[PDB]
Design a protein around this ligand. Structure first.
Ligand SMILES: Nc1ncnc2c1ncn2[C@@H]1O[C@H](COP(=O)(O)OP(=O)(O)OP(=O)(O)O)[C@@H](O)[C@H]1O
Ligand SMILES: Nc1ncnc2c1ncn2[C@@H]1O[C@H](COP(=O)(O)OP(=O)(O)OP(=O)(O)O)[C@@H](O)[C@H]1O
Ligand SMILES: Nc1ncnc2c1ncn2[C@@H]1O[C@H](COP(=O)(O)OP(=O)(O)OP(=O)(O)O)[C@@H](O)[C@H]1O
Ligand SMILES: *[C@@H]1O[C@H](CO)[C@@H](O)[C@H](O)[C@H]1NC(C)=O
Ligand SMILES: *[C@@H]1O[C@H](CO)[C@@H](O)[C@H](O)[C@H]1NC(C)=O
Ligand SMILES: *[C@@H]1O[C@H](CO)[C@@H](O)[C@H](O)[C@H]1NC(C)=O
Ligand SMILES: *[C@@H]1O[C@H](CO)[C@@H](O)[C@H](O)[C@H]1NC(C)=O
Ligand SMILES: *[C@@H]1O[C@H](CO)[C@@H](O)[C@H](O)[C@H]1NC(C)=O
Ligand SMILES: *[C@@H]1O[C@H](CO)[C@@H](O)[C@H](O)[C@H]1NC(C)=O
Ligand SMILES: *[C@@H]1O[C@H](CO)[C@@H](O)[C@H](O)[C@H]1NC(C)=O
Ligand SMILES: *[C@@H]1O[C@H](CO)[C@@H](O)[C@H](O)[C@H]1NC(C)=O
Ligand SMILES: *[C@@H]1O[C@H](CO)[C@@H](O)[C@H](O)[C@H]1NC(C)=O
Ligand SMILES: [Ca+2]
Ligand SMILES: [Ca+2]
Ligand SMILES: [Ca+2]
Ligand SMILES: [Ca+2]
Ligand SMILES: [Mg+2]
Ligand SMILES: [Mg+2]
Ligand SMILES: [Mg+2]
Lengths: 330, 330, 330
């Protein structure tokens, strides 16, 4: 029958167009992919002044709120902190959340099994006028974290300027690319701010813009802390010029339930010697966690992939025709 | 032929059952796989007090033995240290491991090519009563690390509490998950220790338990340093509810030969100004290296993968039937 | 026909040799692959003395130029720095690049929108004899980074010694390997330096050698900063003995445009209390960025992969015969 032959030729044409227009065009079968090597260097340029009761004005420059000062990919930008000044080792009362004692016999000398704050001397001393806590041996100025300021201390960090410099290189093709594309120039970086539509190539990112693009409010996030994920994808075709190679920035919001362990926080201390006595300043820093992950691939024409793909296509076409014949006659 | 037909029916049934069950359900062919974006937050809550000879009791807290303040995937917990207090830059004797001089003519003005300890002035000064070393310019108190304390100074760091906060999100499926699963509540985190048999979901990990689960004894690993690797896997089946997916924690121990480079150690210093003179304290810290690696895969039903797998199965089935016929023919 | 039979036999033997030698032996189809986990430990043994105008001789040791104290995969080695000493918070003039004022009416009280240096009081004060800058609130000794010393302050860091400790393990096969191979003994590390041909397994890497093998001159990188990528690959066959497993060390140079953001730079501060007043030292460090990435794969014989490869090979063989027959029919 002529109709059977027409259907067979239609199936043959369909599979013959499919194999090429998919593997070669859509999937880039003739190209070869290699993993890149990336190093992320970040620089923060902004200032936030925090004034606390009983203390003088505090200046927080880049070195302050950026704790990974060595330009690590994963960095934390300080937005709120609790400061305990002039901590010195000695005999003093512990925190009330650790334990509450009504008499000296209640306290037991030794180390706490869980959440240890200090070596208990064995006496019950008044933490304040109302309650009494067991005396411990440690930094005497207590780190009270029960009161967290509702307005963020470093609330100016919302609309700061964040510079991200990423250099990627493909070892297979020996091609090195950087996020500073040829479209970006020196005068451009002076005033540009990153935008998904307006300024996609501008390497200067606003912290508030980055947080809002991830889906999180900066005000609520700055109080308790947060995690923001930044991904840079390098998808380019090496058959074209290297000018077309441009990085794509995607912001992902890493958050969780506020009822259980809200925000991100950590503690660091600055050790100094004053009046011949070793003292330190303890800060419970509530800051946003920024993680930068770079992944990408580059494709360039090669004979071996093209040949293998041609062979696979022939095999698919041959199998399809034989299978069609089995369907037609059985 | 009847037997040929029976063999063909059997082969067809076998290959059909295979292509319908294995690749479809066992391999999750109908589902699509994607990656996740992860960020690890670690917190150490523990207290260790060391009483070095000739010094006062030293208290170590979270800011002390956790050298990464913000908290990275790779962090070191201090277990043993060698302290060289009050280092000042001047002309003084070097360490005997560098070289031993019997006369002043032996020393040469310059710097050593390998393992340089300072700028040699060309003079031979007695390091102690017995031997003499060439005078160098630098920190006069040399870190004498020939003697390592047999009992770990921070031996209490064995059964401390370690909390790991991991937030993973899949971009294509827009699903965000955290290690704090629905089963874990606020009261649960108050009193729980990670036990793979009893408490697999408890996010609080005991350091000694983590070290023992890696195949290493904590005492020798602490007195000399070591490396412990922790992996978190997120295998989720998005066809079910999100509560079904739970993180799986695996502890792998990274160890080497004790004869060559035993354990892990590093050098850090704290700079201070006392009596108008710049001084520092040098610590040779022997600590366990903890690395957190998070990798996961999620699969959800989709029409395109299902269709491709069905088509592939038909092709495999078709090839198998043709092959069976050829085998029967010959 | 005889020639048709010869062509058929030739195609048969060709596809047989292919399926038996390429996908089985050359590609190790019978083996199975599993990813490894790695933790990198780095240690620098070098000393550089920098003499600056006004300040005394400054001695820099391992703890100094290596800012990551514990030691991560990404670390910075200080090669050049700009030191601003005795920074104290107060009302004082800003940098000329931030803004130049000719009258007090020009300055406006507030903070700069971009690249803020301090809180402008609103009075134009002379920065020096010629120009005047608006008075700001912050660290009064301003970092004047316009003048970069042409000779690197730390140029001796070229031919220093760098030791990399990498411990890898495969969880599937429970085999742990370290970069210290059995050929590397204790006496070997004392007198070996890494080379591509001479000492491929020596774990001591010269910084200048690493920089030069990446295609970069050490002086240009020491002047304005640099980024160097190190990759350690673990390609071994677990069918052989573990002694054959040897890591491969190669260095990748992440080049950057000289006119736009040359090199890598960062800023850190050391806080100290002197004479009861809080002061700090600000350093703008132009240090080379060293990134270490480990990617390895191990293969061991298994029955399931061997069977699948045999089956796939038979399928390819069958398809080829059918295709050949179709061509003969045509
Ligand atoms: N966080 C940032 N916000 C805005 N601009 C930045 C930021 N980081 C860098 N830049 C600009 O990018 C250009 C190149 O930066 P580079 O790494 O050379 O720093 P630099 O110019 O050496 O240091 P500085 O900016 O302190 O002079 C500089 O002109 C700088 O003004
Ligand atoms: N390493 C740890 N060991 C034991 N419990 C921990 C640890 N880290 C956090 N937790 C507990 O988990 C709960 C939620 O964690 P969260 O991030 O709120 O800590 P936190 O309350 O800020 O720390 P802290 O209890 O020191 O004030 C807290 O009540 C805390 O006590
Ligand atoms: N960066 C380096 N350059 C040259 N040799 C090194 C380097 N790091 C380590 N070594 C050598 O490797 C040997 C073993 O190092 P290991 O990790 O045991 O340090 P250590 O001997 O405990 O401490 P240190 O080497 O600081 O005295 C040492 O004898 C040392 O000489
Ligand atoms: C004393 O401290 C406890 C701690 O919980 C607090 O509840 C109480 O109000 C304090 N009393 C005074 C008088 O400050
Ligand atoms: C937002 O950016 C503007 C820049 O025009 C700045 O004036 C403002 O202070 C920023 N907001 C916060 C909360 O810092
Ligand atoms: C600077 O870069 C921008 C990119 O948006 C471009 O439009 C502009 O022409 C560039 N300036 C010069 C002087 O080339
Ligand atoms: C002097 O130092 C050397 C260094 O190895 C040591 O061997 C020797 O015992 C020391 N002598 C005394 C008396 O401490
Ligand atoms: C082990 O844990 C127990 C908790 O009951 C604690 O008392 C003990 O001190 C721990 N061991 C060490 C060596 O710290
Ligand atoms: C707390 O979590 C545990 C998980 O093991 C659960 O058994 C317990 O019921 C939870 N407590 C409450 C009050 O829900
Ligand atoms: C004052 O500082 C400016 C800053 O650009 C500089 O150009 C000028 O030469 C300086 N004048 C003197 C006398 O140092
Ligand atoms: C290069 O290495 C040699 C070792 O013989 C050393 O003397 C020299 O100072 C090194 N060069 C630099 C610039 O440090
Ligand atoms: C030390 O290692 C080297 C590796 O190059 C080897 O040639 C030498 O024989 C080893 N020394 C001893 C004493 O085994
Ligand atoms: Ca650090
Ligand atoms: Ca890291
Ligand atoms: Ca096929
Ligand atoms: Ca001080
Ligand atoms: Mg608390
Ligand atoms: Mg030593
Ligand atoms: Mg500048």
């Amino acid at each position: 029958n002529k109709k059977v032959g027409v259907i067979f030729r239609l199936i043959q044409l369909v599979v013959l167009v499919y194999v090429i227009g998919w593997v070669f065009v859509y999937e880039k079968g003739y190209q070869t992919s290699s993993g890149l090597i990336s190093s992320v260097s970040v620089k923060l340029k902004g200032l936030a002044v925090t004034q606390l009761q009983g203390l003088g004005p505090q200046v927080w420059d880049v070195a302050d709120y950026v704790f990974p000062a060595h330009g690590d990919s994963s960095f934390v930008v300080m937005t709120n902190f609790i400061m305990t000044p002039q901590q010195a080792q000695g005999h003093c009362a512990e925190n009330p959340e650790g334990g509450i004692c009504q008499d000296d016999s209640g306290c037991t000398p030794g180390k706490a099994e869980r959440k240890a704050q200090g070596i208990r001397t064995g006496n019950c001393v008044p933490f304040n006028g109302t309650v009494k806590t067991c005396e411990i041996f440690g930094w005497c100025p207590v780190e009270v974290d029960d009161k967290i300021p509702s307005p963020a201390l470093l609330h100016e960090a919302e609309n700061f300027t964040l510079f991200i410099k990423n250099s990627i290189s493909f070892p297979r093709f020996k091609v090195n690319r950087r996020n500073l594309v040829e479209e970006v120039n020196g005068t451009y970086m002076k005033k540009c701010l990153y935008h998904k539509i307006l300024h996609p190539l501008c390497p200067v990112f606003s912290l508030g813009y980055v947080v809002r693009e991830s889906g999180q409010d900066f005000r609520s996030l700055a109080e308790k802390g947060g995690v923001v994920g930044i991904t840079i994808d390098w998808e380019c075709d090496l058959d074209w010029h290297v000018r077309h190679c441009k990085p794509i920035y995607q912001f992902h919001g890493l958050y969780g339930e506020k009822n259980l362990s809200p925000g991100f926080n950590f503690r660091f201390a600055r050790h100094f010697v004053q009046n011949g006595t070793n003292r330190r300043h303890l800060f419970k820093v509530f800051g946003i966690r920024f993680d930068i992950l770079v992944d990408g691939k580059a494709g360039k024409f090669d004979i071996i992939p093209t040949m293998t793909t041609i062979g696979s296509g022939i095999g698919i076409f041959g199998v399809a025709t034989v299978l069609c014949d089995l369907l037609l006659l059985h």
